[PDB]
Amino acid sequence: NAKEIVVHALRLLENGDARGWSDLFHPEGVLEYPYPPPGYKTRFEGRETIWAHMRLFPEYMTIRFTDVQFYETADPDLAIGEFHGDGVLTASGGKLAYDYIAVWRTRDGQILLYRLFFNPLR
Numbered sequence: 001n002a003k004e005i006v007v008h009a010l011r012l013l014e015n016g017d018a019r020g021w022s023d024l025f026h027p028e029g030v031l032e033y034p035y036p037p038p039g040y041k042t043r044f045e046g047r048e049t050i051w052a053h054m055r056l057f058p059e060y061m062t063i064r065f066t067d068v069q070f071y072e073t074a075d076p077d078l079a080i081g082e083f084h085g086d087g088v089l090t091a092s093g094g095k096l097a098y099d100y101i102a103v104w105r106t107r108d109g110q111i112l113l114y115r116l117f118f119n120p121l122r
């Protein structure tokens with residue numbers, strides 16, 4: 001189910017496995033930053049592109065997430081949840097913090113939609 005897939009993914013990212021995380025997306029699957037920070041795209045259509053975006057992730061930062069607080073949905077293939085992320089820039093130093101809310105949509109064990117809200121000012 002979606003909640004299962006989401007936790008899996010977040011774990012993969014915590015482990016720095018960006019290809020894995022990427023791989024969890026349906027080929028024509030989409031990543032979105034509804035409130036994108038400046039200098040970044042806001043939609044990433046297709047696994048290849050999502051991968052291209054996330055490729056560099058582990059090189060600049062390492063993240064650790066709080067446990068997702070999901071809200072109960074009807075559809076088991078839709079998950080809506082809030083969670084926090086703390087990052088440490090490989091620079092290094094740089095502690096970086098995020099408070100998310102996301103709408104995940106899955107099918108046959110793959111991620112179709114990853115809509116990740118966060119504060120672009122912050």
Ligand SMILES: C[C@]12CC[C@H](O)C[C@H]1CC[C@@H]1[C@@H]2C[C@@H](O)[C@]2(C)[C@@H](C3=CC(=O)OC3)CC[C@]12O
Pocket residue numbers: 010013037040057063085098116118
């Ligand atoms: C917007 C962001 C800001 C920090 C850094 O400059 C990289 C950019 C692009 C990549 C972006 C970070 C913030 C982070 O919170 C992210 C949203 C983070 C993610 C968490 C998640 O569940 O999906 C992606 C990993 C990296 C991230 O995807």
